[PDB]
Design an enzyme around this catalytic site. Structure first.
Site, PDB file in Angstrom:
ATOM      1  N   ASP A  21       0.812  -1.233   0.000  1.00  0.00           N
ATOM      2  CA  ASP A  21       0.000   0.000   0.000  1.00  0.00           C
ATOM      3  C   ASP A  21       0.823   1.250   0.000  1.00  0.00           C
ATOM      4  O   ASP A  21       0.299   2.331   0.254  1.00  0.00           O
ATOM      5  CB  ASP A  21      -1.029  -0.030   1.149  1.00  0.00           C
ATOM      6  CG  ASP A  21      -0.383  -0.182   2.482  1.00  0.00           C
ATOM      7  OD1 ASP A  21       0.820   0.140   2.630  1.00  0.00           O
ATOM      8  OD2 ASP A  21      -1.098  -0.564   3.460  1.00  0.00           O
ATOM      9  N   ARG A  35       1.113   6.841   0.322  1.00  0.00           N
ATOM     10  CA  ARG A  35       0.348   5.821   1.012  1.00  0.00           C
ATOM     11  C   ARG A  35      -1.041   5.788   0.410  1.00  0.00           C
ATOM     12  O   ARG A  35      -1.713   6.786   0.387  1.00  0.00           O
ATOM     13  CB  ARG A  35       0.310   6.162   2.497  1.00  0.00           C
ATOM     14  CG  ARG A  35      -0.492   5.209   3.377  1.00  0.00           C
ATOM     15  CD  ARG A  35       0.041   3.794   3.284  1.00  0.00           C
ATOM     16  NE  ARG A  35      -0.498   2.952   4.325  1.00  0.00           N
ATOM     17  CZ  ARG A  35      -1.751   2.452   4.336  1.00  0.00           C
ATOM     18  NH1 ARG A  35      -2.581   2.629   3.331  1.00  0.00           N
ATOM     19  NH2 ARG A  35      -2.169   1.700   5.357  1.00  0.00           N
ATOM     20  N   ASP A  40      -5.496  -1.047   3.862  1.00  0.00           N
ATOM     21  CA  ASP A  40      -4.395  -1.522   4.709  1.00  0.00           C
ATOM     22  C   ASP A  40      -3.993  -2.918   4.255  1.00  0.00           C
ATOM     23  O   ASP A  40      -4.802  -3.824   4.325  1.00  0.00           O
ATOM     24  CB  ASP A  40      -4.747  -1.554   6.172  1.00  0.00           C
ATOM     25  CG  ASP A  40      -3.574  -1.747   7.073  1.00  0.00           C
ATOM     26  OD1 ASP A  40      -2.496  -1.280   6.751  1.00  0.00           O
ATOM     27  OD2 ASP A  40      -3.809  -2.310   8.167  1.00  0.00           O
ATOM     28  N   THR A  41      -2.809  -3.032   3.671  1.00  0.00           N
ATOM     29  CA  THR A  41      -2.258  -4.317   3.338  1.00  0.00           C
ATOM     30  C   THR A  41      -1.487  -4.887   4.518  1.00  0.00           C
ATOM     31  O   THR A  41      -0.991  -4.146   5.377  1.00  0.00           O
ATOM     32  CB  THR A  41      -1.367  -4.223   2.078  1.00  0.00           C
ATOM     33  OG1 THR A  41      -0.390  -3.178   2.269  1.00  0.00           O
ATOM     34  CG2 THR A  41      -2.191  -3.911   0.857  1.00  0.00           C
ATOM     35  N   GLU A  43       1.599  -6.226   6.540  1.00  0.00           N
ATOM     36  CA  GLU A  43       3.032  -5.970   6.476  1.00  0.00           C
ATOM     37  C   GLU A  43       3.732  -7.093   5.791  1.00  0.00           C
ATOM     38  O   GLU A  43       3.262  -8.209   5.804  1.00  0.00           O
ATOM     39  CB  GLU A  43       3.558  -5.724   7.881  1.00  0.00           C
ATOM     40  CG  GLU A  43       2.928  -4.410   8.402  1.00  0.00           C
ATOM     41  CD  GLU A  43       3.486  -3.912   9.702  1.00  0.00           C
ATOM     42  OE1 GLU A  43       4.341  -4.606  10.300  1.00  0.00           O
ATOM     43  OE2 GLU A  43       2.996  -2.856  10.209  1.00  0.00           O
ATOM     44  N   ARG A  81       3.962  11.250   4.087  1.00  0.00           N
ATOM     45  CA  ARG A  81       3.604  10.512   2.888  1.00  0.00           C
ATOM     46  C   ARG A  81       2.406  11.224   2.247  1.00  0.00           C
ATOM     47  O   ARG A  81       1.478  11.602   2.927  1.00  0.00           O
ATOM     48  CB  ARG A  81       3.282   9.056   3.195  1.00  0.00           C
ATOM     49  CG  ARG A  81       4.502   8.288   3.691  1.00  0.00           C
ATOM     50  CD  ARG A  81       4.197   6.828   3.941  1.00  0.00           C
ATOM     51  NE  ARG A  81       3.180   6.683   4.968  1.00  0.00           N
ATOM     52  CZ  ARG A  81       2.709   5.553   5.420  1.00  0.00           C
ATOM     53  NH1 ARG A  81       3.283   4.352   5.063  1.00  0.00           N
ATOM     54  NH2 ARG A  81       1.671   5.589   6.193  1.00  0.00           N
TER      55      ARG A  81
END
Ligand SMILES: Cc1cn([C@H]2C[C@H](OP(=O)(O)O)[C@@H](COP(=O)(O)O)O2)c(=O)[nH]c1=O
Ligand SMILES: [Ca+2]
EC number: 3.1.31.1
Length: 136
Positions: A21, A35, A40-41, A43, A81
């Site tokens: 992401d 971002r 939300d991917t 980690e 970001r």
């Protein structure tokens, strides 16, 4: 009655894919880490992390045309970001991740929620299909 400008897509060039992401792009001639909004991917070290990273990397590296689309609210996060929807040859990466079950809808702030319902539709289909993060 008056209006505000609609969202619009701006060109950018890939510098590097970072993770599921996050992608670094050359935007108006300066490097910026983006971002992806509303997602939300996992980690990289978590289940499905590598697959999410790889899916985004392939999408952005194979694209002839990358575009950045800011939403109507905050443009940067507290880490500096950029916060945007990213498109690769017209296909939204944010949406594609969610649709594949490689990202959850997340970080949904009312200021920056234009594609909320689109992504929630994608997530519902990924869940019904028991893909990736939804497989159990
Ligand atoms: C998507 C998004 C993330 N973030 C920030 C919050 C999280 O930092 P905090 O946990 O310190 O609040 C961070 C998560 O990034 P990653 O998911 O890239 O690790 O991204 C925003 O501030 N706004 C957003 O719209
Ligand atoms: Ca993440």
């Amino acid at each position: 009655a008056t209006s505000t400008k609609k969202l619009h897509k701006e060109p950018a060039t890939l510098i590097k894919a970072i993770d599921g992401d996050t992608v670094k792009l050359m935007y108006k001639g300066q490097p910026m880490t983006f971002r992806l909004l509303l997602v939300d991917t996992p980690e990289f070290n978590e289940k499905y992390g590598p697959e999410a990273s790889a899916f985004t990397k392939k999408m952005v590296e194979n694209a002839k045309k990358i575009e950045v689309e800011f939403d109507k609210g905050q443009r940067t996060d507290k880490y500096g970001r950029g916060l945007a929807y990213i498109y690769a040859d017209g296909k939204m990466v944010n949406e594609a991740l969610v649709r594949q079950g490689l990202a959850k809808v997340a970080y949904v702030y009312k200021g920056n929620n234009t594609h909320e319902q689109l992504l929630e539709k994608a997530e519902a289909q990924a869940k019904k299909e028991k893909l990736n993060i939804w497989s159990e």
